[PDB]
Paper text:
We isolated MCC–eisosomes from S. cerevisiae using a gentle purification procedure, preserving a lattice of untagged Pil1/Lsp1 structural proteins bound to a presumably intact plasma membrane bilayer in a near-native state, observable as a two-layer density in the protein tubule. Although MCC–eisosomes have been shown to have a furrow-like half-pipe structure in vivo, our isolated eisosome tubules seem to be closed, continuous helices of Pil1/Lsp1 proteins. Using a symmetry expansion and density subtraction strategy, we could refine our structures to a resolution of around 3.2 Å, which allowed us to build models of the paralogues Pil1 and Lsp1. With our improved resolution, we could characterize the lattice contact sites between Pil1 dimers in detail. Two novel structured regions of the protein were visible in our maps: (1) a folded N terminus (Nt) that forms lattice contact sites with the Nt of a neighbouring dimer, followed by (2) an Nt amphipathic helix (AH; residues 39–48) buried within the lipid density of the cytoplasmic leaflet of the bilayer that runs parallel to the BAR-domain helices of each Pil1/Lsp1 monomer. By making one-pixel slices through the unsharpened maps parallel to the axis of the eisosome tubule, we could clearly see the well-defined protein density of the AH buried in the cytoplasmic leaflet of the membrane, which is visible in these images as a uniform density of lower intensity (teal arrow). At slices around 5 Å deeper, an array of small voids in the membrane density begins to appear just below the AH. This pattern continues throughout the cytoplasmic leaflet, producing a fence-like striation in the membrane (violet arrows). Visualization of the electrostatic surface on the membrane-facing surface of the Pil1 dimer revealed two patches of intense positive charge adjacent to the AHs.
The yeast eisosome, composed of the BAR-domain proteins Pil1 and Lsp1 (hereafter, Pil1/Lsp1), scaffolds a membrane compartment that senses and responds to mechanical stress by flattening and releasing sequestered factors. MCC–eisosomes are relatively stable, and have been implicated in sensing and responding to plasma membrane stress: various stimuli, including hypo-osmotic shock, heat shock and mechanical pressure, cause eisosomes to flatten and release sequestered proteins to affect signalling or transport functions. Here we isolated near-native eisosomes as helical tubules made up of a lattice of Pil1/Lsp1 bound to plasma membrane lipids, and solved their structures by helical reconstruction.
Numbering used by the authors:
A (entry chain J), B (entry chain D), C (entry chain K): 1 to 271
Write the structure that this text describes.
């Protein structure tokens, strides 16, 4: 995190912040709750109350990420609707504005499609986490039985050491202890192997999505040169638009670069 | 778009799709509507019914992108909650799992903060679009007056050419035509100059966010090597964790790279 | 298709569209359904509900193309009626108009006859498709039996592995598997050989019909020069018509060209 040695909510600015000052906080952060939905905030609480004790926090994480997934599909549909609206609105303006808006809407629709693919990959990762949630929830009854049986052993040996079930309960306890030891070993292996794999898949999806949107942004930034900021005096008017071929070539190149992109084609090199 | 010469919904696979087959569609795409909220789908319709005719589609786009912004802040809060839940859940597991989960939660919280910054930039871009929406909505009464006055001229010249207001209405029409010509010129300039600038700012925010999340993904992928997939037999147990310094160095390097990142530091080079 | 990189229903204009702007949409596209008939839209649904599962979409295609054929015979009868009506109406006008209308009606009747011949060829192609529909519908019971028998094998081997019918059912399954393999091979060969042949015959009929109507259109366009656009002042009147021989020669040449036309005589050379 970009925090600092301070007792205030202010954070340490970065190079981008120094070059570009941050905008004021969004006007869409209205004071209702930031909730999004009542079911959104109640599903998590319902999942975190019932079920096995061991599989409680993990179930909460699964439900929270399911809400993440729902909100992401909502924002993907919203963004594709915004692209459609921009494409529709581009008609009323000049030819150059119309073409630029159409290409920008195409790029935003492509971004929405990539978001949907990332949504599918995120659901795959969520199911991978659900598997470990289920196995830990199934493991929990073993240790619950172990503690119940050891409590019974302590109670019987305290109330009457010369009980008829003097050693049968102890032998059952030791075999349950062996079963619980095997269960704990397999739980550790599976949890730690599907955490490092589900999160690896999630990070692969993250980097692929980020690279694709970065390519989209770069190609749109290069396309935006066809639009002109030259202002016209009220009497005058521009000559006819002639940059159709340039826009066509740039969108063809964008599509080709997106198709060619692979895991090894990522230019991001962390240090 | 990655479409193909086909009459089916199937799309042309890319290099990543060929290398990695796509997962099945998400189980969170439940059949209610995909709506998200009733207000979400009614605000747009309300904005697209009233107001000036010219500033109707643009108002719909503004409202749709406001819904985009709300859903994005919702998903940012959801993701930060997921990071907090993962950090909390990391306690119950081994020391290495605890440390890895803590660092992953830190990275996800950083991603959420970057999402919030992108949300602020998106709201700035939305306000930039709102400015052109307002100016076109103010321009529309001029042309509405022009058409009303020309309709009155046609009606008067058809019903009785020798009307007392024979030429005063024509002179008022020509001065209104000059005003409308100036208005159309300034509307074209401002719309086409704030579209190429608001979208340029939006694409700058997009590429910055994408590069930052790509760096986060790469650093997390490099951090995930400290986690081990080696399985332990039920009897045995590992030696104590000793990779604290490696994780500390990798998160310090991630923070330094994020702070150092600037607009010119982007390694994405579109063709 | 002549689509474009756009999010609107507008299509990319062609050279003919640039030279000749497209007319407004037809006034005969009235809002009832575009149905044509209740039986037209219910026959397909009835065919697509019953019958073998494999021979379901193909039966729907056969029924839809039967409706195509019925509507084509309807339009051929309608066009021949239009030609008859034009020939009848030509009497009330001048001699040149009468002769031109008579020859145009002859050409339209010839076009209707060619449409009827194409209708017969289309029905032949539809019967060719019906043959493969029937063979796939007969093949489907084999695989249905195979799945039923393998389901029985799984059920018997799960409920009681030491069943009296331990291996007789397996041997019956393997012989059914051999029969189904032969059936699948022959189905693939026949389907893929009668698709490439029925569609080849259909395309031969298409190109022959198109060339014949193109020759008819060219000959009618050359005949329309006998009609004169010269306007007469109210007092004056033209001399008597004398272009009977020219029209006779042009229709004789049209008939000779239509008779001489063969498959190798087509001047259309695709690239």
């Amino acid at each position: 995190m970009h925090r600092t040695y301070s007792l205030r909510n202010s954070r340490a600015p970065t190079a981008s912040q120094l070059q570009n000052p941050p905008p004021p906080p969004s006007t869409t952060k209205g004071r209702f709750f930031g909730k999004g939905g009542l079911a959104y905030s109640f599903r998590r609480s319902a999942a975190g109350a019932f079920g096995p004790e061991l599989s409680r926090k993990l179930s909460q994480l699964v439900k929270i990420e399911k809400n993440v997934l729902r909100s992401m599909e909502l924002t993907a549909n919203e963004r594709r609707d915004a692209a459609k609206q921009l494409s529709i609105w581009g008609l009323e303006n000049d030819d150059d504005v119309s073409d630029i808006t159409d290409k920008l809407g195409v790029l935003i629709y492509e971004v929405s499609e990539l978001d949907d693919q990332f949504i599918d990959r995120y659901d795959q990762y969520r199911l991978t986490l659900k598997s470990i949630r289920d196995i830990e929830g199934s493991v929990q009854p073993s240790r619950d039985r172990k503690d119940k049986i050891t409590d019974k052993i302590a109670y019987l040996k305290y109330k009457d050491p010369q009980s008829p079930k003097i050693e049968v309960l102890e032998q059952e306890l030791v075999r349950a202890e062996a079963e619980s030891l095997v269960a704990e070993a397999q739980l550790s292996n599976i949890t730690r192997s599907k955490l490092r794999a589900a999160f690896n898949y999630q990070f692969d999806s993250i980097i692929e999505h980020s690279e694709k949107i970065a390519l989209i942004a770069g190609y749109g930034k290069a396309l935006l040169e066809l639009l002109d900021d030259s202002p016209v005096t009220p009497g005058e008017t521009r000559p006819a638009y002639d940059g159709y071929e340039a826009s066509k070539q740039i969108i063809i190149d964008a599509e080709s670069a997106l198709n060619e992109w692979t895991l090894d084609s990522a230019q991001v090199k962390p240090t």
